[PDB]
Design an enzyme around this catalytic site. Structure first.
Site, PDB file in Angstrom:
ATOM      1  CG  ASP A  22      78.798 107.203  81.592  1.00 57.42           C
ATOM      2  OD1 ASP A  22      78.715 106.037  81.249  1.00 57.42           O
ATOM      3  OD2 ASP A  22      79.582 107.436  82.227  1.00 57.42           O
ATOM      4  CE1 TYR A  29      81.858 108.164  88.117  1.00 61.05           C
ATOM      5  CE2 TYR A  29      80.082 108.375  86.397  1.00 61.05           C
ATOM      6  CZ  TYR A  29      81.447 107.918  86.790  1.00 61.05           C
ATOM      7  OH  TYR A  29      81.858 107.483  85.504  1.00 61.05           O
ATOM      8  CE  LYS A  82      80.573 104.436  83.488  1.00 61.92           C
ATOM      9  NZ  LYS A  82      80.101 105.747  84.239  1.00 61.92           N
ATOM     10  CG  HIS A  94      83.193 102.164  87.346  1.00 56.34           C
ATOM     11  ND1 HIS A  94      82.378 102.953  87.989  1.00 56.34           N
ATOM     12  CD2 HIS A  94      84.233 102.859  86.702  1.00 56.34           C
ATOM     13  CE1 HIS A  94      82.758 104.251  87.767  1.00 56.34           C
ATOM     14  NE2 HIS A  94      83.800 104.280  86.971  1.00 56.34           N
TER      15      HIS A  94
HETATM   16  N1  LIG Z   1      84.532 104.567  82.955  1.00 53.08           N
HETATM   17  C1  LIG Z   1      85.340 105.587  83.811  1.00 53.08           C
HETATM   18  O1  LIG Z   1      86.147 104.947  84.526  1.00 53.08           O
HETATM   19  C2  LIG Z   1      85.110 106.818  83.633  1.00 53.08           C
HETATM   20  C3  LIG Z   1      86.180 107.740  83.937  1.00 53.08           C
HETATM   21  C4  LIG Z   1      86.179 109.052  83.712  1.00 53.08           C
HETATM   22  C5  LIG Z   1      84.953 109.518  83.115  1.00 53.08           C
HETATM   23  N2  LIG Z   1      83.966 108.773  82.805  1.00 53.08           N
HETATM   24  C6  LIG Z   1      82.855 109.240  82.049  1.00 53.08           C
HETATM   25  O2  LIG Z   1      82.900 110.305  81.262  1.00 53.08           O
HETATM   26  C7  LIG Z   1      82.435 111.793  81.488  1.00 53.08           C
HETATM   27  C8  LIG Z   1      83.432 112.735  80.805  1.00 53.08           C
HETATM   28  O3  LIG Z   1      84.746 112.697  81.401  1.00 53.08           O
HETATM   29  P1  LIG Z   1      84.905 113.716  82.472  1.00 53.08           P
HETATM   30  O4  LIG Z   1      83.931 114.058  83.353  1.00 53.08           O
HETATM   31  O5  LIG Z   1      86.446 113.073  83.160  1.00 53.08           O
HETATM   32  O6  LIG Z   1      85.517 115.053  81.805  1.00 53.08           O
HETATM   33  P2  LIG Z   1      85.488 115.700  80.276  1.00 53.08           P
HETATM   34  O7  LIG Z   1      83.996 115.415  80.067  1.00 53.08           O
HETATM   35  O8  LIG Z   1      86.685 115.611  79.266  1.00 53.08           O
HETATM   36  O9  LIG Z   1      85.563 117.121  80.666  1.00 53.08           O
HETATM   37  C9  LIG Z   1      84.579 117.801  81.669  1.00 53.08           C
HETATM   38  C10 LIG Z   1      84.975 119.307  82.053  1.00 53.08           C
HETATM   39  O10 LIG Z   1      85.078 119.997  80.824  1.00 53.08           O
HETATM   40  C11 LIG Z   1      84.194 121.047  81.212  1.00 53.08           C
HETATM   41  N3  LIG Z   1      83.423 121.652  79.743  1.00 53.08           N
HETATM   42  C12 LIG Z   1      82.337 120.808  79.173  1.00 53.08           C
HETATM   43  N4  LIG Z   1      82.117 121.242  78.113  1.00 53.08           N
HETATM   44  C13 LIG Z   1      82.924 122.187  77.755  1.00 53.08           C
HETATM   45  C14 LIG Z   1      83.171 123.349  76.852  1.00 53.08           C
HETATM   46  N5  LIG Z   1      82.267 123.241  75.717  1.00 53.08           N
HETATM   47  N6  LIG Z   1      84.159 124.137  76.929  1.00 53.08           N
HETATM   48  C15 LIG Z   1      84.679 124.239  78.017  1.00 53.08           C
HETATM   49  N7  LIG Z   1      84.624 123.330  78.896  1.00 53.08           N
HETATM   50  C16 LIG Z   1      83.698 122.468  78.863  1.00 53.08           C
HETATM   51  C17 LIG Z   1      83.138 120.746  82.319  1.00 53.08           C
HETATM   52  O11 LIG Z   1      82.921 121.799  82.863  1.00 53.08           O
HETATM   53  P3  LIG Z   1      81.385 122.311  83.298  1.00 53.08           P
HETATM   54  O12 LIG Z   1      80.892 120.801  83.919  1.00 53.08           O
HETATM   55  O13 LIG Z   1      81.702 123.305  84.668  1.00 53.08           O
HETATM   56  O14 LIG Z   1      80.536 123.098  82.321  1.00 53.08           O
HETATM   57  C18 LIG Z   1      84.109 119.871  83.048  1.00 53.08           C
HETATM   58  O15 LIG Z   1      84.861 120.553  84.025  1.00 53.08           O
HETATM   59  C19 LIG Z   1      82.339 111.568  82.796  1.00 53.08           C
HETATM   60  O16 LIG Z   1      81.466 112.519  83.453  1.00 53.08           O
HETATM   61  C20 LIG Z   1      81.969 110.093  83.137  1.00 53.08           C
HETATM   62  O17 LIG Z   1      80.750 109.869  82.890  1.00 53.08           O
HETATM   63  C21 LIG Z   1      84.152 107.454  82.861  1.00 53.08           C
HETATM   64  C1  LIG Z   2      91.209 105.362  96.960  1.00 52.93           C
HETATM   65  S1  LIG Z   2      91.772 107.061  96.664  1.00 52.93           S
HETATM   66  C2  LIG Z   2      91.461 107.083  94.974  1.00 52.93           C
HETATM   67  C3  LIG Z   2      91.878 106.078  94.054  1.00 52.93           C
HETATM   68  C4  LIG Z   2      91.265 106.467  92.697  1.00 52.93           C
HETATM   69  C5  LIG Z   2      90.421 107.431  92.303  1.00 52.93           C
HETATM   70  C6  LIG Z   2      89.939 107.233  91.102  1.00 52.93           C
HETATM   71  C7  LIG Z   2      88.862 107.747  90.491  1.00 52.93           C
HETATM   72  C8  LIG Z   2      88.420 107.959  89.020  1.00 52.93           C
HETATM   73  C9  LIG Z   2      89.786 107.856  88.127  1.00 52.93           C
HETATM   74  C10 LIG Z   2      87.202 108.181  88.710  1.00 52.93           C
HETATM   75  C11 LIG Z   2      86.433 108.302  87.577  1.00 52.93           C
HETATM   76  C12 LIG Z   2      85.938 107.016  87.233  1.00 52.93           C
HETATM   77  O1  LIG Z   2      86.343 106.103  87.517  1.00 52.93           O
HETATM   78  O2  LIG Z   2      85.017 107.106  86.571  1.00 52.93           O
HETATM   79  C13 LIG Z   2      86.544 108.235  89.926  1.00 52.93           C
HETATM   80  C14 LIG Z   2      85.278 108.496  90.666  1.00 52.93           C
HETATM   81  C15 LIG Z   2      84.720 108.520  91.819  1.00 52.93           C
HETATM   82  F1  LIG Z   2      83.384 108.736  92.170  1.00 52.93           F
HETATM   83  C16 LIG Z   2      85.634 108.029  92.812  1.00 52.93           C
HETATM   84  C17 LIG Z   2      87.054 107.868  92.547  1.00 52.93           C
HETATM   85  C18 LIG Z   2      87.638 107.971  91.141  1.00 52.93           C
HETATM   86  C19 LIG Z   2      89.928 108.273  93.258  1.00 52.93           C
HETATM   87  C20 LIG Z   2      90.601 108.416  94.464  1.00 52.93           C
END
Ligand SMILES: NC(=O)c1ccc[n+]([C@@H]2O[C@H](COP(=O)([O-])OP(=O)(O)OC[C@H]3O[C@@H](n4cnc5c(N)ncnc54)[C@H](OP(=O)(O)O)[C@@H]3O)[C@@H](O)[C@H]2O)c1
Ligand SMILES: CSc1ccc(/C=C2/C(C)=C(CC(=O)O)c3cc(F)ccc32)cc1
Length: 318
Positions: A46, A51, A80, A113
């Site tokens: 993803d 990012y 996205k 996105h």
């Molecule tokens: N569409 C959107 O708006 C949106 C928003 C948020 C996220 N996303 C996508 O979803 C992905 C995952 O969400 P996220 O990055 O917000 O958080 P997440 O996957 O819930 O958590 C990531 C965090 O957990 C740690 N971690 C990973 N595996 C672990 C394990 N087995 N044990 C303990 N800690 C662990 C990682 O540390 P380390 O990396 O240091 O190991 C990192 O700090 C994002 O990277 C992004 O691709 C999309």
């Molecule tokens: C304009 S002040 C602001 C406003 C909104 C956000 C929120 C963000 C969120 C929820 C995400 C994760 C995602 O949408 O995947 C993000 C990823 C990025 F690279 C940059 C900003 C953001 C951060 C800063």
């Protein structure tokens, strides 16, 4: 464990239900992280322009293709469209920029996105002199038509949305002259934000749901001490212990058993492997319902900057 590795999308393609997230993965570490992920079996990555690490992710994919660890057809790459590119005339270029950085000739899935369009320009969040984010006058139905053109030009196999509420999903489904339905809605989902209604609605329409922040995004930059912590929840740890698995493994298996795709992020080789080892156990219907009971409607990603934007998604109940 009564768990297939991929599910069928409404475009005819299959999508691996486990993917690697890359939001916050530093540019100097994400290349090895993606190499390790593919080496241990991940086939779905993803990504997003916003990012700022798509070039580095692409280096990894390209090397693994060159080494013949995997074929392109076996990979499922998602990116996205950022909010400052909703304008019809900017969509193709944004897609091509992502393709060039990722070093691919097509994406398996391209998502809008956020439902919120911003004024185009260099800044990801353009502000007026008062600190408000400046919107674009583009509406999401025209943006959707632009996305449909990408399928018809061969740049992406599937198109979808992210952070759309059920009324916004509905608006697309009811679009006059709709050509391709969204294949996916990617939304935040974990035991503190279970999303029963939105998930039921999407699945009822044949739209597959991807659960983001499944571990609760402990590295989110705005985290605070009062915040709940899934990984530290004794109740969740208890269920893990009972199964001889880690708390993270339980948190990842949870959405898989709801027919969701899930995309945990890590740049840690040990955790990358651990997070994939979730096809060897089964949570009981009781475990599932108990995990669901922990819902708090608590969001990691609330886009608090844009609550006044007309298309802000989280005023609606779902
Ligand atoms: N569409 C959107 O708006 C949106 C928003 C948020 C996220 N996303 C996508 O979803 C992905 C995952 O969400 P996220 O990055 O917000 O958080 P997440 O996957 O819930 O958590 C990531 C965090 O957990 C740690 N971690 C990973 N595996 C672990 C394990 N087995 N044990 C303990 N800690 C662990 C990682 O540390 P380390 O990396 O240091 O190991 C990192 O700090 C994002 O990277 C992004 O691709 C999309
Ligand atoms: C304009 S002040 C602001 C406003 C909104 C956000 C929120 C963000 C969120 C929820 C995400 C994760 C995602 O949408 O995947 C993000 C990823 C990025 F690279 C940059 C900003 C953001 C951060 C800063």
């Amino acid at each position: 464990s009564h768990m297939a590795s991929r599910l069928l999308l409404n475009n005819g393609a299959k999508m691996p239900i486990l993917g690697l997230g890359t939001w916050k993965s530093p540019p100097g570490q994400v290349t090895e992280a993606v190499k390790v992920a593919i080496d241990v079996g991940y086939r779905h990555i993803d990504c997003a322009h916003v990012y700022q690490n798509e070039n580095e992710v692409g280096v990894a994919i390209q090397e693994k293709l060159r080494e013949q660890v995997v074929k392109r057809e076996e990979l499922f790459i998602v990116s996205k469209l950022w909010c400052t590119y909703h304008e019809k005339g900017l969509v193709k270029g944004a897609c091509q920029k992502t393709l060039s950085d990722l070093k691919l000739d097509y994406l398996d899935l391209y998502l809008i996105h956020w439902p919120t369009g911003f004024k185009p320009g260099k800044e990801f969040f353009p502000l007026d002199e008062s600190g408000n984010v400046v919107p674009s006058d583009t509406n999401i139905l025209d943006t959707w038509a632009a996305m449909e053109e990408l399928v018809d030009e061969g740049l992406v196999k599937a198109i979808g949305i992210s952070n759309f509420n059920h009324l916004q999903v509905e608006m697309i489904l009811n679009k006059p002259g709709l050509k391709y339905k969204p294949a996916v809605n990617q939304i935040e989902c974990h035991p503190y934000l279970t999303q029963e209604k939105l998930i039921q609605y999407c699945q009822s329409k044949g739209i597959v749901v991807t659960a983001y922040s499944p571990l609760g995004s402990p590295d989110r930059p705005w985290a605070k001490p009062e915040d709940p912590s899934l990984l530290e929840d004794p109740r969740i740890k208890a269920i893990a212990a009972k199964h001889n698995k880690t708390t993270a493994q339980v948190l990842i298996r949870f959405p898989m058993q709801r027919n969701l795709v899930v995309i945990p992020k890590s740049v840690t080789p040990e955790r990358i492997a651990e997070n994939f080892k979730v096809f060897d156990f089964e949570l009981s219907s009781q475990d599932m319902t108990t995990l669901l009971s922990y819902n708090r409607n608590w969001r990691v990603c609330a886009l608090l900057s844009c609550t006044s934007h007309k298309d802000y998604p989280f005023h609606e109940e779902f």
